[PDB]
RNA sequence: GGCACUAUGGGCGCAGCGUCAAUGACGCUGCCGGUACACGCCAGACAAGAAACACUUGUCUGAUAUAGUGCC
C-alpha cells in the first residue's frame, strides 16, 4: 500500500564537532530513493542528500548518505553551528511520496533546573467566564519536562495547553508555558491551585501553588 | 540562484471553502520537470501532497487530499498551480511547491523548493485579543528576580505582537508559540524575568497589537499586596 | 528462494459480438488446426531520451518461457 518512513532519533542533542548519525527505517523496498533534506525555522528545505547516497551539487562534503537494505542514515561527520536544525528522509521509490517525521538536532549544553512560577488568573478575566492557571517553567535544560496540573490534589486532564519557546540563542537555554483551563464555576468550587513540574535539573518534583483569594 | 519558485495564493478561508495555490517558476522550462507539492502543518514535519511528471501530465495524490486537490500546470504561463477545494481545517499548513531534479544531476530529490505560502482552514471569525495580567505574588520572589506577563487570549487569526515599556525591555523576555485552542481561537502570553527589588518603584506595561482586529491594547501589570 | 510433479494452435490460434470496466474483469459463439525456423507483429524486461507513469527510440526475453500444488 503505503511505504512508511520512520526516522531516528526524533531529537538529538549534540555539540559541536559531534559524529551525528540519524537514520530513517523504510517498510517496504524504496530500492535508492531516499533524499535527505534540513529544514531551519520559517525557511524552506534544502536539498542534502540524493539516491540515498549521493551528495547534492553545493552541499558540505560533511554529510554523507547511507544504505542499508530498507535503513537508511545519514551521518554529519563534524557538527557545525550552521548545522542545528530539522533534518527529514523521504522516499520517492512510488507514489505517495512519503516523508519520514523529522530529527531536530538540538545544542547540549549542561543541565539548568527550570525556574518555575505560577499565575493566578485576573479578577478581569472572570468577568469572562473563563479562568486561566498560567504555569511558567523558566530557562532550564534539557527539554523534556512533565507540568502535572492539580485542584485540590486532583490532577486535572484534557484542560492545559503548552507551548515551549525554541532554544534561546545566548544561554540555549528553553522556556515553557502551560495554562490550564477552567470555567469560573469550577474555578471557585476549589481552592488549591497547583503545578507540579518533573525536570532533569529537579533533585525532586518542584511544586507551585497558591490559595484562590490572597491579597 | 536563477533558479527561483515564487509561490502565492495562500489564505484564509473557511472550511469546505476552496483556493487556488500558484507556483510560477523561473530560470528554467517548467515542462521538463516534475513539480510537487509538500505541505507542513504548524510544528509538524513535511507531508507529501501531489505531483506532476513530465512529457505525459501525469498527476500523483495522498490519500489525505484525494479527489479535493488537483495538481496542474501551465507551460505558457511557466506556472504549476494547486487547486485545493473542499478545505478542512486538517488541511491548515504552510504550503510548498518544489522542483524534481534533473534525473542525472540529483536523481529524483527536490533541488529548489518555494518559499512557502500559508494556508489557514478555519470556521472562526475575526476576533482581537482579551489582555490579561500575569501578575506576579508576595510569596517566594527570593530569587533576586520576580516574573510577571501578560495573557494574550481568544484572538483570530495570528500574528499578535507583544513588546514591553513599548519596547525598551526585552532582556529576558518571553513570547511563547500561540497555541490553537478547542475554541478555535488563539492564546499565547507574554512573560518577563525583573529585578524582584523594582516592582512596585517600576512600571510594566506589555503592548499587544493584533493588526487583523485593528486591535492595540497596553497592559499594566501591577503587583497585589499583603 | 530451491526441489518436485502438474499444465501451455501462433510467446502472436484465426475472428466476431456483447462488453462491462475505470483498469478491475472478460466471456460466449463461430472458425479452422503440418513442424520448426525466418521474420513481422504484440507482450514483458532493460536502458536512454530534459523522462518514476505515458510517450519515442534502442537492446533483450517469451521456452527452458510463463502457470499451479506439495515439499522444504
Known amino acids: 500500500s503505503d511505504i512508511q518512513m520512520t526516522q531516528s532519533p526524533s531529537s538529538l542533542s549534540a555539540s559541536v564537532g559531534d559524529r551525528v548519525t540519524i537514520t530513517c527505517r523504510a517498510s517496504?523496498?524504496?530500492?535508492?530513493?531516499v533524499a535527505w533534506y534540513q529544514q531551519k525555522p520559517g525557511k524552506a528545505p534544502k536539498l542534502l542528500i540524493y539516491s540515498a547516497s549521493s551528495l547534492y551539487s553545493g552541499v558540505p562534503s560533511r554529510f554523507s548518505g547511507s544504505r542499508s537494505g530498507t535503513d537508511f542514515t545519514l551521518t554529519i561527520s563534524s557538527l557545525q553551528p550552521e548545522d542545528f536544525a530539522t533534518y527529514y528522509c523521504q522516499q520517492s521509490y512510488s507514489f505517495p511520496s512519503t516523508f519520514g517525521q523529522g530529527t531536530k538536532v538540538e545544542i547540549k549544553r549542561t543541565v539548568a533546573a527550570p525556574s518555575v512560577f505560577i499565575f493566578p488568573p485576573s479578577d478581569e478575566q472572570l468577568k469572562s467566564g473563563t479562568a486561566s492557571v498560567v504555569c511558567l517553567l523558566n530557562n532550564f535544560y534539557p527539554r523534556e519536562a512533565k507540568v502535572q496540573w492539580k485542584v485540590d490534589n486532583a490532577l486535572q486532564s484534557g484542560n492545559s495547553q503548552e507551548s515551549v519557546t525554541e532554544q534561546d540563542s545566548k544561554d540555549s537555554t528553553y522556556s515553557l508555558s502551560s495554562t490550564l483551563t477552567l470555567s469560573k464555576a469550577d474555578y471557585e468550587k476549589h481552592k488549591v491551585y497547583a503545578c507540579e513540574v518533573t525536570h532533569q535539573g529537579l533533585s525532586s518534583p518542584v511544586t507551585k501553588s497558591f490559595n484562590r483569594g490572597e491579597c | 540562484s536563477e533558479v527561483q519558485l515564487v509561490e502565492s495564493g495562500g489564505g484564509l478561508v473557511q472550511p469546505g471553502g476552496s483556493l487556488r495555490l500558484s507556483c510560477a517558476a523561473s530560470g528554467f522550462y517548467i515542462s521538463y520537470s516534475s513539480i510537487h507539492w509538500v505541505r507542513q502543518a504548524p510544528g509538524k514535519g513535511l507531508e507529501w501532497v501531489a505531483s506532476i511528471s513530465p512529457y505525459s501530465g501525469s498527476t500523483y495524490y495522498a490519500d489525505s487530499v484525494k479527489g479535493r486537490f488537483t495538481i496542474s500546470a501551465d507551460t505558457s504561463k511557466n506556472t504549476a498551480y494547486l487547486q485545493m477545494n473542499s478545505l478542512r481545517a486538517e488541511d491548515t499548513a504552510v504550503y510548498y511547491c518544489?522542483?524534481?531534479?534533473?534525473?542525472?544531476?540529483?536523481?529524483?530529490?527536490?533541488?529548489?523548493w518555494g518559499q512557502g505560502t500559508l494556508v489557514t482552514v478555519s470556521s472562526a471569525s475575526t476576533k482581537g485579543p482579551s489582555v490579561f495580567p500575569l501578575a506576579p505574588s508576595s510569596k517566594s520572589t527570593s530569587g533576586g528576580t520576580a516574573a510577571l506577563g501578560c495573557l494574550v487570549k481568544d484572538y483570530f487569526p495570528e500574528p499578535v505582537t507583544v513588546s514591553w515599556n513599548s519596547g525598551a525591555l526585552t532582556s529576558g523576555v518571553h513570547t511563547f508559540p500561540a497555541v490553537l485552542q478547542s475554541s478555535g481561537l488563539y492564546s499565547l502570553s507574554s512573560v518577563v524575568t525583573v529585578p524582584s527589588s523594582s516592582l512596585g518603584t517600576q512600571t510594566y506595561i506589555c503592548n499587544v497589537n493584533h493588526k487583523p482586529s485593528n486591535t492595540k491594547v497596553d497592559k499594566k501589570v501591577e503587583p497585589k499586596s499583603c
Open positions: 518544489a522542483r524534481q531534479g534533473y534525473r542525472r544531476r540529483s536523481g529524483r530529490g527536490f533541488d529548489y
Open positions: 517496504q523496498s524504496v530500492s535508492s530513493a
